[PDB]
Amino acid sequence: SSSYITAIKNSSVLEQSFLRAILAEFRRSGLEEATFQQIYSQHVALCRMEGLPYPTMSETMAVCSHLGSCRLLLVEPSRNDLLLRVRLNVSQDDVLYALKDE
Amino acid sequence: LENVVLCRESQVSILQSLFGERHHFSFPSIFIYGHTASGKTYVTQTLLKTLELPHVFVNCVECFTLRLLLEQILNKLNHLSTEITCETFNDFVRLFKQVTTAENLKDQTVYIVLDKAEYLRDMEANLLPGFLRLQELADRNVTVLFLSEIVWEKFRPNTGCFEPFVLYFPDYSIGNLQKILSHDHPPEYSADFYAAYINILLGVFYTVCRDLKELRHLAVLNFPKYCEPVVKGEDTRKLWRNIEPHLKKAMQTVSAHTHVELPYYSKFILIAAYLASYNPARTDKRFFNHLLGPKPFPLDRLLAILYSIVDSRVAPTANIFSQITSLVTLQLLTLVGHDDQLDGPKYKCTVSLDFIRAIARTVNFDIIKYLYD
Amino acid sequence: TECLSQVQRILRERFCRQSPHSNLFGVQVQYKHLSELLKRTALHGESNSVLIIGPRGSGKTMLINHALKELMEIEESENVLQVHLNGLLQINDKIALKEITRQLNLENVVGDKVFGSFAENLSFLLEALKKGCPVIFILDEFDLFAHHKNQTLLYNLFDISQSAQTPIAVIGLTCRLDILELLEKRVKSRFSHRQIHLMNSFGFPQYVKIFKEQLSLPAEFPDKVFAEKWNENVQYLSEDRSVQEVLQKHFNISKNLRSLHMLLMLALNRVTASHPFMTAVDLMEASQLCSMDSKANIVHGLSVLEICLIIAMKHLNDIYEEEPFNFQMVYNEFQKFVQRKAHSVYNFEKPVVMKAFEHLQQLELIKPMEREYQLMKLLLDNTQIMNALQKYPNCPTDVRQWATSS
Amino acid sequence: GCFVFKPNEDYFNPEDSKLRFETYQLIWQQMKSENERLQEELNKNLFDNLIEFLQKSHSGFQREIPTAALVLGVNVTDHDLTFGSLTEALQNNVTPYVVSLQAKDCPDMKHFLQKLISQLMDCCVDIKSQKTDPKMLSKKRTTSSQWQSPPVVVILKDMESFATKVLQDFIIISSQHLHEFPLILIFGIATSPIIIHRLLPHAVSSLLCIELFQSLSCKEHLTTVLDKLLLTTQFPFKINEKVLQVLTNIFLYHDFSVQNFIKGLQLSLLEHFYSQPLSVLCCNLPEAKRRINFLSNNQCENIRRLPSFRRYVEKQASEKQVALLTNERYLKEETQLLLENLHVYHMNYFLVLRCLHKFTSSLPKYPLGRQIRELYCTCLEKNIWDSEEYASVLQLLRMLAKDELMTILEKCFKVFKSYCENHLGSTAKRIEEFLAQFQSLDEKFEVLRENVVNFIDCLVREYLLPPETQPLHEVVYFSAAHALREHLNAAPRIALHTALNNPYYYLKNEANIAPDICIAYKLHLECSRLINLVDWSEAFATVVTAAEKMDTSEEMNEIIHARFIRAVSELELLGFIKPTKQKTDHVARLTW
Amino acid sequence: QQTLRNLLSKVSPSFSAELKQLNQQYEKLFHKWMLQLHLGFNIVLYGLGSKRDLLERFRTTMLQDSIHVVINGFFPGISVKSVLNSITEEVLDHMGTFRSILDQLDWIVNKFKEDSSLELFLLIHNLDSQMLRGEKSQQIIGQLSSLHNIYLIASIDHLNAPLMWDHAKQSLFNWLWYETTTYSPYTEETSYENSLLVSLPLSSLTHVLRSLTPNARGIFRLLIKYQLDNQDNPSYIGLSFQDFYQQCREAFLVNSDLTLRAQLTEFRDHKLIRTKKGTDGVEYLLIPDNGTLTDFLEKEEE
Ligand SMILES: Nc1ncnc2c1ncn2[C@@H]1O[C@H](COP(=O)(O)OP(=O)(O)OP(=O)(O)O)[C@@H](O)[C@H]1O
Ligand SMILES: Nc1ncnc2c1ncn2[C@@H]1O[C@H](COP(=O)(O)OP(=O)(O)OP(=O)(O)O)[C@@H](O)[C@H]1O
């Protein structure tokens, strides 16, 4: 079986909204690259919509290194810190099925 | 060594509590960030000197290679013999178990204090996550105490690591900066009067630098200058109104002359290099914003504008080309094609305009309408 | 008393050393999958080489050491010769060979000839062991292990695990997900595939139970009355909804079961001076000392010349947008603001303004990508500065009007 | 392909080689030795201040680290000599712990520390009679417990070519523990102390103690070495004004260095000793009198037949011309007193030239010459009283007659009152002749009339053009300007332009016959915007089709194409056209 | 190339007598060179035609007694490592140290100060080339030649040939400059460089492979893997220096920024990595085909 959808299925809430921010920016741009402040703005919008508290980017970068450690996405270093160009390691319909199934 | 705290008591207390007594385990790794003013080795050294938790202190500025960093850790540790050699990391984890088996330090939580870890950040990729897991790597009751200038968020290895417990040592507050910037040790005055001086000086001066070291330096400079007309003339308000006239200029003043004699063709070379750097949107044809900086331009354009500036007896000798190479070693010109080839790349100008004005005016040339207008 | 030092000693080890506490939760099926495989590779000469993948901070090392201890309890010491490696220490092949020499007590025979083919080297290690026999290879931090120059200690282990048939388990402990795709194709096609574990977390209402079973004083008795009093206090704090509120807040940032250890560790550091039974508010401030905004602590501490400079950089985004700027445009914007203002307090002259830059570069809020008037890059958010300027305690009115102008 | 062969002195080449070469070696070795002594004298006022400053900043040690940033000149050529002298001075009057770093032997920190401790180990192990950092401190603790713990100083030679990282790390390491190991670094800033703020960020720049020093601005260094080296009576070999003009121009315009000037004077001396067979008696006067009296007779015919002496033949009477033409015994006698007159002309020339220099440097705006160098120039290019510049001095000197002129007549008279008996015998006894004029200086008309007779006697008597006034002057003077200038400062970018545009060497080629490559370049730059390959090959084929028919077409196309491609590889090779990649083909006109 | 060079020198260079005479002007100039070189000068001579045969005739007529290291500069095998290596073995009659270039530089300096009248002087054809120059490279020749006991003679061919000497670099060898012209075509350069009418084969990459550190070999393993794995993507415009820095740093091949930049610029010398500037201004890196790039590290790992 494939590891990645089960990793998304047992991810936390802010990770799932981070992947939703990733797909929202990838629907906006169309590209496979995105910088961290763009998906951070998308993540701020989604945490606003869900009634969650404010996503500080210490937490958002901790969760970005969480998802980059587990290779659901492909990362730039934490030294660049706002200028991280992220690619998505899995295809988009896979993560749409992963957050669509429930 | 004298005052342990000077009113930063809660962070001191939670760190002191976090150490615990000796026979039980503590944290693996503790990271402390904060500003460079903020006492981050004052507080921990006066904390560690009190209880005498048997510790090793290092600076990673000192150890520029990995072997010296392991060597001084193991050599300072075993005193608490010969140089107990370790070329590699696994040698350090091997010899650490033999070193930490003595009755001074068998049960005691050994602290390996690491200062200015941002230089350790580019030592290797191995050593930082290897150092963060030392409590279960060697399993010998260790707590590696980090302190750094930089945030932890850039400091992580982008694989993840054992995330340390992270403290923020706070910056000093204003009334705390009245108190702890030497309300102790005034030699000859009342402490009220030296506090009155520095209370006047600080509230003026709390907008440029909150660094305690240089403010201690500036205070011990401009306090005897303040202190002389009290003990000579004789009322704090009048000499407050005298000391701030000196304080504005002492602020402004903390670079002899910009003019440098040059050989004559070198003067004309960098005159031509400035003039082809600062308005060069193909305005070669006319005579013969500014704020973004110097635009790059190739060598033959520089030689053509050199021929236009100088009296026409110039020959392209070996010495004028050797001189144009030797201008770059003195960093008055820069090649921005770093390796494009030996043939003449874009040479961009890197000297200020007033210096250029002085070099142009010392050989009969007014150029400011000629330069960008 | 006896109680406070004893509860801190017995709770601190399973707290922050991650000592072997016997309760394990969410992992029973993966453990029971591992155990019979380990029993039949250990009891018999056959060699199968399982692989485990999970996230950092959860699972792996606790599971393999717990299964290790429970297997070591069964005798016939069975002459299983375990060997612990890590990916971090043994970076190269020459270190790895001598480390296997170290663990397997080989230096009675001297072996002092560096052989060319390292299959002969590994087979000699196993050969001189075999005439002297099971081994269990615990290959921790496999993702760093997969960056050898020639992948020797990856591939020769798999070749010997299929070919020498000395009892072997190559148990790889990884952290990144693609251990197969990062693995080179001769080894990944060779013998990487024994059955692969996956490791993940579980639901929040059982995670409150794992908080309670983590925090409770154990079946070891320091003093049984204090055990009953304190774990009843653990349950009374556990049923209170503010602890549940901060624990749900901790769940959505962290499913990790390592962050819970630290979050609870700060709370237990607070408790033994007075009120040995603690509050939900004490857990709340223990969560609060685990910070959320690392950058407001940096920006909040800075003096106001750096403040008006960094809001000038923010203003450099809000005209002539998206270039990596240099010093001169920052100087121009600062001068245009200070000429908009009437007072001559803050018209600080040119070499002072460079000092704020070369202090500010050390904080890495500004990035280098010529030497002093070039191409500097900002890595920051507006809104943390907008919150920081109202939290500045001695914030002057003119930089406040600069903030409202923006 | 660097193949080595293993093999498995007094050759110079009339002008016979042995005493010629020994005369060369004597003159140049003497000149170089006195050059080094006169180098080390001038910097004493500079670095004996530095000994005071370093002694004061060491002795108050019971947070700071002292730096003394020298501002040396732009001449990197002679920076070794000042540092050798300063190393000598600081080694003698302060500590025998002086090391220097070069900024080319340490790109990073391990090299820095290893070469520093190796230099320190040899410097301590000589005068008492290892990658580690704190062992250097342990070396300081062992090796000098006593003698008031003398401070180890390092000498960074180039501040500028150091990278900032290794320098910052070293200053923070040294400033961390200077409790033991007091270190006082002295980096030689090549430009100006502005750039120590540029190369050092503010935390490390705030760590220390800056006290800058000047250095000798090089114009009043070369006035000393030109003034002592050739303007004296002492050294037997003078120089022509035109060759000197070439040497001083390539000083003052391009190079701004003095070691290059001494290389130019050495080359002039060498080429003079190659050139002419009468150069052998370039000596002092009894050493001249040694073998004037015995010499080969064809060189004595050469002493008859060189053109300055034949000018002297033209001005003289027949009854001694008939015996002095050919016979050696009288030719020795007249040439000996001619060489004595040469020394006489030098000795009465130079001291009154210095007198005129002091009398002219006193003037407002100094219209004749700025310094002592150019006064040699203005009295030899034009005739001096013919020229308008000494006319401007003479027009100036009338109404300048006040007590400034009398006071500086007294002052210039005092400085050549030191040179009164430093001349010690004058060739007209002009010291006490002019001093007999100059002794009424203590007792406003008299300054005017005394001025008139002094400059008239002075300048009309001796201050004349040395070639025409003096026969046998070729022996002392060397003159070949644009022979030398191309040896010392050549121009290949003019040489290729010349030999490519006009490759006429001596049959008909000046404005099609005997290039291949100049045909290629000339035809390249007859279509002078840019070029593509095939049409350029056809144009070259057209012009050597003309060359062929001014003395089958497919074999001719083959050989024309082959010699075309042999030409075009060189025209790429020699700094012209750069290959235009990824297109079909073209060439790019890279030099206009 | 070969069938192109069969037609070379078929019939008739259009002058021979003045070429023989113009070269025959310069044979009188040689004892001046020997004396001038004995005093410690250094002769550069430039020209428009081939003058290495004049230097060969010079070394035949006057260098039958002394050591000469005839360093060709035209074929791409020679770098200054080979200069120091051959001058260590084949001149000093024993091998030297091996750790670094500066160590053998200082050591070969150190051998000559004690051994008087050893009297070795090399001479270099084509001192300016694509391979010979460099601030690491030329300064070793300079520091070598600055001594009393070593007398180099060179030839420069380029139009920008005195661009690679600062005054401090120029003060190491006392230059004086001769003018020559021969008009002979430079047959060795034009032979052994290239011809355009017909990339790099395996031999020079094996020679760089055998003269570099194994960590540099592991570095170009990474770079050639990232090149070969994205060969048919026309948007792949090369890795950045920062991306290659971190992907080199993850496999522990190099420690610092400056070490990797120095390795990059000494591999940029060999023309097996080219820098391209994109619209950011940041230099990306791509080397000059794909099928010749799999043969090496196919065979470097069997
Ligand atoms: N609370 C305090 N009371 C008295 N002096 C203090 C206090 N805090 C800091 N200092 C001064 O600061 C110096 C120590 O500097 P500090 O501890 O700030 O270094 P640091 O924070 O480690 O520096 P960096 O962060 O740059 O490594 C001491 O010498 C002392 O003079
Ligand atoms: N199911 C579980 N049962 C008991 N403890 C657990 C469980 N999951 C996680 N933990 C705790 O989480 C931490 C896991 O540490 P461990 O080293 O075993 O895994 P890991 O940290 O992911 O591995 P690595 O050290 O390679 O990152 C330990 O504190 C362990 O006590």
**DSSP string computed for C187-227:** HHTTT--SPBP------HHHHHHHHHHHHS--SS-S-HHHH
Two structure tokens written together for A37: 């402040």
From the CB of residue C165, how many other CB atoms can be counted at a distance below 10 Å?
A: 11
Two structure tokens written together for B185: 């040790």
Tell me whether strands D587-588 and D578-579 are parallel, antiparallel or unpaired: antiparallel
Query: Are the C-beta atoms of D441 and D409 separated by less than 8 Å?
Result: yes
The verdict on a CB contact (< 8 Å) between C294 and B33 is yes
Query: Are the C-beta atoms of E104 and E143 separated by less than 8 Å?
Result: no
Residue by residue, DSSP assigns B244-258 as: HHHHHHHHHH-----
Two structure tokens written together for C67: 């299964």
Q: D352 with D391, same domain?
A: yes
Q: C406 CA to chain E: closest CA distance, Å?
A: 28
Cα–Cα dist B334/B344, whole Å: 12
Helix/strand/coil for B198 = helix
Asked if residue D35 belongs to a domain, the reply is: no
Q: Which residue of C has its CA nearest to E240?
A: C369
Two structure tokens written together for B121: 């950040």
Tell the burial category of B105 from Cβ atoms under 10 Å away from its Cβ (0-12, 13-18, 19+). buried
Distance of alpha carbon E284 from the chain centroid: 26
Query: Are the C-beta atoms of D223 and D231 separated by less than 8 Å?
Result: no
Q: D306 with D331, same domain?
A: yes
Write down the experimental method used for this entry: cryo-EM
Paired residues of B57 in beta bridges: B113
Query: DSSP code of A91?
Result: -
Cα–Cα dist E258/D109, whole Å: 12
Return the best residue to mutate from C18, C28, C173, C177 for the ligand 2 pocket (most ligand atoms within 8 A of CB). Answer: C18
The CATH number fitting domain E202-299, selected from 1.10.3720.10, 1.10.10.10, 1.10.10.60, 1.25.50.10: 1.10.10.10
* Half-sphere exposure in the Cβ direction for C230 (13 Å, CA): 25
Nearest CB neighbour to A56, from listed C176, C293, C377: C293
Q: Give the residue before each break in chain A, using a C-to-N cut-off of over 2.5 angstroms; say none if it is continuous.
A: none
Helix/strand/coil for D426 = coil
Residue by residue, DSSP assigns B279-306 as: S-SSTHHHH---TT-PPP--HHHHHHHH
The residues near B290 (Cβ < 8 Å, ≥ 6 apart) are: B278, B372
From the CB of residue C321, how many other CB atoms can be counted at a distance below 10 Å?
A: 7
C57 marked ligand binding residue? yes
Nearest CB neighbour to D496, from listed E39, E159, E256: E159
Q: Between the CA of residue D518 and those of B66, C357, D524, D589, what are the distances in Å?
A: 61, 58, 9, 16
Query: Are the C-beta atoms of C23 and C145 separated by less than 8 Å?
Result: no
Task: For chain C, report the end-to-end CA distance as a whole number of angstroms.
Answer: 60
Q: D509 with D436, same domain?
A: no
Pocket of ligand 1 contains residue B127 by CB under 6 Å: no
Judging contact as 3 or more Cβ pairs under 8 Å, the answer for B and A is yes
State which residues form the domain around D171.
Answer: 44-210
For D404-413, b/e burial (b = at least 16 CB within 10 A) is ebbebbeebb
For ligand 2, atom 28, the nearest C-alpha belongs to: C18
**Is B263's Cβ below 8 Å from some Cβ in D?**
yes
Bin C383: left if φ > 0, else alpha if -120 < ψ < 50, else beta: alpha
Instruction: Determine the residue type at D85.
Output: S
Cα–Cα dist C298/C307, whole Å: 11
Tell me whether strands E68-71 and D3-5 are parallel, antiparallel or unpaired: antiparallel
The verdict on a CB contact (< 8 Å) between E214 and C147 is no
Q: D185 with D244, same domain?
A: no
From the CB of residue D566, how many other CB atoms can be counted at a distance below 10 Å?
A: 22
User: If you count DSSP H runs as helices and E runs as strands, how many of each does chain C have, helices first?
Assistant: 20, 6
Paired residues of D98 in beta bridges: D153
SS3 content of chain E, % helix, strand, coil (to 5): 45, 10, 45
Cα–Cα dist C163/B1, whole Å: 66
C17 marked ligand binding residue? no
The verdict on a CB contact (< 8 Å) between D108 and E158 is no
Q: Which residue of B has its CA nearest to C89?
A: B90
Nearest CB neighbour to D198, from listed C355, C362, C372: C372
| Residue that the structure tokens 């392991």 belong to | B70
The verdict on a CB contact (< 8 Å) between E176 and D76 is no
Pocket of ligand 1 contains residue B173 by CB under 6 Å: no
The C-alpha R_g of chain D, in whole angstroms, comes to 33
Residue ranges per structural domain of chain E? 2-192, 202-299
State which residues form the domain around B53.
Answer: 9-168
Query: DSSP code of B338?
Result: S
Q: D129 with D149, same domain?
A: yes
The verdict on a CB contact (< 8 Å) between D562 and E177 is no
Residue D74: CATH number of its domain = 3.40.50.300
Nearest Cα to Cα of residue A57 among A93, A5, A14: A14
Tell the burial category of E114 from Cβ atoms under 10 Å away from its Cβ (0-12, 13-18, 19+). exposed
Two structure tokens written together for C331: 């100087």
Tell the burial category of E152 from Cβ atoms under 10 Å away from its Cβ (0-12, 13-18, 19+). buried
Query: Are the C-beta atoms of B265 and B311 separated by less than 8 Å?
Result: no
State which residues form the domain around A37.
Answer: 3-100
SS3 content of chain D, % helix, strand, coil (to 5): 60, 5, 35
Query: DSSP code of D156?
Result: E
Residues of B in contact with D161 (CB under 8 A): 329
Asked if residue D320 belongs to a domain, the reply is: yes
Cα–Cα dist C189/C195, whole Å: 14
Query: DSSP code of E212?
Result: S
Q: A42 CA to chain C: closest CA distance, Å?
A: 13
Query: Are the C-beta atoms of C289 and C381 separated by less than 8 Å?
Result: no
| Residue that the structure tokens 């008006």 belong to | C308
Calculate the CA dihedral of residues B288, B294, B298, B302 and round it to 10 degrees: 40
Q: Give the residue before each break in chain E, using a C-to-N cut-off of over 2.5 angstroms; say none if it is continuous.
A: 198, 288
Q: D575 with D438, same domain?
A: no
CB under 6 Å to ligand 2: residues? Answer: C 18, 24-27, 54, 56-62, 173, 175, 257-258, 261
Pocket of ligand 1 contains residue B140 by CB under 6 Å: no
B160 marked ligand binding residue? no
- CATH code given to domain E2-192: 3.40.50.300
Query: Are the C-beta atoms of D408 and D359 separated by less than 8 Å?
Result: yes
The length of chain E is 302
Asked if residue D423 belongs to a domain, the reply is: yes
Q: Which residue of B has its CA nearest to D260?
A: B319
Cα–Cα dist C83/C49, whole Å: 14
Q: C198 CA to chain A: closest CA distance, Å?
A: 7
Tell me whether strands D578-579 and D209-210 are parallel, antiparallel or unpaired: unpaired
The verdict on a CB contact (< 8 Å) between C369 and E251 is no
Å resolution of this model? 5.0
The verdict on a CB contact (< 8 Å) between A77 and B158 is yes
Q: Which of A10, A39, A47 has the most C C-beta neighbours within 10 Å, making it the best mutation to test the interface with C? A: A10
Two structure tokens written together for D163: 């990278």
Helix/strand/coil for E172 = coil
From the CB of residue C19, how many other CB atoms can be counted at a distance below 10 Å?
A: 14
For ligand 2, atom 16, the nearest C-alpha belongs to: C61
**Is B233's Cβ below 8 Å from some Cβ in D?**
no
The residues near D20 (Cβ < 8 Å, ≥ 6 apart) are: D12, D273, D279, D280
Nearest Cα to Cα of residue C21 among C216, C186, C177: C216
Paired residues of E69 in beta bridges: D4
Query: Are the C-beta atoms of C324 and C377 separated by less than 8 Å?
Result: yes
Cα–Cα dist E189/D569, whole Å: 9
Cα–Cα dist C244/C230, whole Å: 18
The verdict on a CB contact (< 8 Å) between D73 and B343 is no
User: If you count DSSP H runs as helices and E runs as strands, how many of each does chain E have, helices first?
Assistant: 14, 7
Query: DSSP code of E26?
Result: G
Cα–Cα dist B77/B83, whole Å: 11
For ligand 1, atom 1, the nearest C-alpha belongs to: B6
Cα–Cα dist D206/B233, whole Å: 34
Q: Which atom of ligand 1 is nearest to the CA of B148?
A: 25
Could you give the angle at the alpha carbon of C308 between the alpha carbons of C302 and C312, nearest 5°? Answer: 125
Least distant ligand from the CA of B9: 1
Residue A69: CATH number of its domain = 1.10.10.10
Pocket of ligand 1 contains residue B184 by CB under 6 Å: no
H or E segment and range at residue C140: strand C135-140
Judging contact as 3 or more Cβ pairs under 8 Å, the answer for D and A is no
C400 marked ligand binding residue? no
Calculate the CA dihedral of residues A31, A36, A37, A41 and round it to 10 degrees: 70
Could you give the angle at the alpha carbon of B79 between the alpha carbons of B73 and B80, nearest 5°? Answer: 95
Q: D303 with D451, same domain?
A: yes
Query: DSSP code of D213?
Result: B
Residue by residue, DSSP assigns D578-591 as: EE-TTSS--EE---
Two structure tokens written together for C9: 């000693």
Cα–Cα dist D249/B317, whole Å: 14
Could you give the angle at the alpha carbon of E277 between the alpha carbons of D162 and E163, nearest 5°? Answer: 50
Helix/strand/coil for E179 = strand
Q: How many domains does chain D have?
A: 3
Calculate the CA dihedral of residues E273, E275, E280, E282 and round it to 10 degrees: 70
Bin D16: left if φ > 0, else alpha if -120 < ψ < 50, else beta: beta
Q: D154 with D264, same domain?
A: no
Two structure tokens written together for D323: 């015996």
* Half-sphere exposure in the Cβ direction for C41 (13 Å, CA): 25
Q: D279 with D306, same domain?
A: yes
Nearest Cα to Cα of residue B310 among B271, B350, B368: B271
The verdict on a CB contact (< 8 Å) between C379 and A83 is yes
For ligand 2, atom 9, the nearest C-alpha belongs to: C58
End residue of a domain, out of D156, D190, D210: D210
Query: Are the C-beta atoms of C243 and C279 separated by less than 8 Å?
Result: no
**Is C373's Cβ below 8 Å from some Cβ in D?**
no
Least distant ligand from the CA of C256: 2
Q: Between the CA of residue C294 and those of A85, C384, D307, what are the distances in Å?
A: 22, 10, 93
For C209-229, b/e burial (b = at least 16 CB within 10 A) is ebbeebbbbeeeebeeebbee
Two structure tokens written together for C38: 């380990």
Tell the burial category of C404 from Cβ atoms under 10 Å away from its Cβ (0-12, 13-18, 19+). exposed
Asked if residue D250 belongs to a domain, the reply is: yes
Instruction: Determine the residue type at B260.
Output: V
Helix/strand/coil for D70 = strand
Q: D387 with D263, same domain?
A: yes
For ligand 1, atom 24, the nearest C-alpha belongs to: B36
Cα–Cα dist A12/A39, whole Å: 17
Least distant ligand from the CA of C200: 2
Q: How many domains does chain A have?
A: 1
The verdict on a CB contact (< 8 Å) between E190 and D569 is yes
Cα–Cα dist E276/E224, whole Å: 17
Two structure tokens written together for A41: 């703005």
Cα–Cα dist D531/C198, whole Å: 67
Helix/strand/coil for D471 = coil
The alpha carbon of A8 and the centre of ligand 2 are apart by a number of angstroms equal to 20
